Ligand binder design. Structure first.
Ligand SMILES: Nc1nc2c(ncn2[C@@H]2O[C@H](COP(=O)(O)OP(=O)(O)O)[C@@H](O)[C@H]2O)c(=O)[nH]1
Ligand SMILES: Nc1nc2c(ncn2[C@@H]2O[C@H](COP(=O)(O)OP(=O)(O)O)[C@@H](O)[C@H]2O)c(=O)[nH]1
Ligand SMILES: [Mg+2]
Length: 414
């Protein structure tokens, strides 16, 4: 048998709308990540999607067919059990141009990524460009480019696009990134992709002695109809542990916390609770480390967590010291052009009194620029952000032609 363990790595899946991201995750894991009503009706990812799979290798078989996602080697002609390598997980991002902020919030959780490029669409499409730029900005450099839908183009066309992709990455940080052709729909060459994941998206070093921090991307009420009047649970909070570790029965707090009234003013009150349970997928654990998206059970009133109420929060230990800031100072840089538009325009300099969008960890916040300098802006936010470390990455977006567009990036200066 294979061990039951948490995923140890988060692999983002990004790219232009309808290029096959969600179908690719299904090809690898068997899971369709779209669970919301609107997602199923529109046939598109809207919230961040998630799926897990074990990875192993049949030591008697040849690569890439030796790579498997289940404990059998029958497919490569061996009766031996495959050696367990690791459990991995996927963050399935929306490629819709209006959902870039959600993509950015997911990118904060990624240890590496797959950029999916449809072989039967002109290259590079706007969000192919935009997601590529975002990965580079955020520092997700462990990248595999997947050439999807090769089932519906000729060898000639696929090779032509292959050359254009290599020329696109030429002279960039991604110059040496592998390109792997697949059909997600017909599950062709998926084994080569799994091999590629093992080779190019290794499990990164973790620091388990840093103060525990989890970035929140989901929260919900797990209570269902037809259940006994006392089997019901406190709120559950879902996210990615980015450093340290959490254990059942630990005293934790949610930051910035709950929006409340205090002395005639809007205020945020840290939410204190205790970990009641830890779950990855369908399995319970006594502790949780970086890698995967974890579900943290709490003793909170489920009305506090329902409907992704706590998205953008962080969780730390109860006694941890973490800045929660209404005003932030950012050492910034601007992109030269707006890459996400069909027509790429120049980026105008930041001006005082502009309303900008700030992506910090899993959080997304609007604020007003109160100050602009050469290297530095100060922003008054519509709600505070938890800044758990010095020099955290922020991505800056501006509303251009009715759409929020990434225009720069920086470090939050504390
Ligand atoms: N022919 C072909 N169609 C595909 C392939 N992968 C995905 N599709 C189709 O592309 C459409 C969008 O796929 P989806 O997973 O929703 O892409 P996403 O929007 O990037 O997440 C669906 O109709 C898929 O069935 C493929 O490898 N070959
Ligand atoms: N920690 C913890 N997580 C849970 C518990 N029950 C469900 N979850 C997690 O909550 C997530 C969604 O639950 P599910 O019943 O599948 O869907 P939902 O209830 O409609 O949101 C899953 O990732 C589960 O692993 C629990 O008792 N404790
Ligand atoms: Mg999708």
């Amino acid at each position: 048998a294979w061990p039951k363990v948490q995923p140890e790595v988060n692999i983002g899946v990004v790219g232009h709308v309808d290029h096959g991201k969600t179908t690719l995750v299904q090809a690898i894991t068997g899971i369709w990540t779209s669970k919301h009503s609107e997602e199923l009706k529109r046939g598109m990812t809207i919230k961040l999607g998630y799926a897990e799979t074990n990875i192993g290798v049949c030591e008697s078989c040849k690569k890439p067919e030796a790579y498997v996602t289940e404990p059998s080697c029958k497919s490569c002609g061996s009766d031996d059990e495959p050696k367990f390598l690791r459990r991995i997980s996927f963050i399935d991002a929306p490629g819709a141009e209006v959902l870039m902020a959600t993509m950015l919030s997911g990118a904060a959780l990624m240890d590496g990524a797959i950029l999916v490029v449809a072989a039967n669409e002109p290259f590079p499409q706007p969000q192919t460009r935009e997601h590529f730029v975002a990965l580079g900005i955020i520092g997700v450099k462990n990248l595999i480019i997947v050439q999807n839908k090769v089932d519906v183009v000729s060898k000639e066309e696929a090779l032509s696009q292959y050359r254009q992709i290599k020329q696109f990455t030429k002279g960039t940080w991604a110059e040496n990134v592998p390109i792997i052709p697949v059909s997600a729909l017909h599950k062709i060459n998926i084994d080569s992709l799994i091999e590629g994941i093992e080779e190019y998206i290794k499990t990164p070093y973790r620091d388990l002695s840093q103060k525990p921090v989890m970035l929140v991307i989901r929260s919900f009420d797990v209570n269902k109809p037809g259940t006994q009047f006392n089997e019901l649970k406190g709120g559950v909070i879902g996210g990615s542990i980015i450093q340290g570790l959490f254990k059942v029965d630990q005293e934790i707090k949610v930051l910035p916390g709950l929006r409340v009234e205090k002395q005639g003013k809007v205020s945020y009150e840290p939410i204190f609770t205790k970990i009641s349970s830890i779950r990855f997928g369908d399995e319970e654990f006594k502790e949780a480390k970086p890698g995967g998206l974890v579900a943290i059970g709490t003793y909170l009133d489920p009305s506090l967590t329902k409907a992704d109420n706590l998205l953008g929060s962080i969780i730390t230990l109860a006694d941890a010291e973490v800045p929660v800031l209404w005003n932030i100072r950012i050492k910034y840089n601007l992109l030269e052009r707006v890459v996400g538009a069909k027509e790429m325009l120049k980026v105008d300099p930041i001006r005082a009194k502009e309303t900008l969008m700030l992506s910090v960890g899993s959080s997304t916040t609007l604020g007003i620029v109160t100050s602009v300098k050469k290297d530095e802006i100060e922003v008054e936010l519509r709600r505070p952000v938890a800044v758990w470390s010095n020099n955290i990455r922020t991505v800056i977006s501006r509303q251009i032609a009715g759409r929020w567009r990434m225009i720069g990036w920086g470090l939050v200066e504390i």
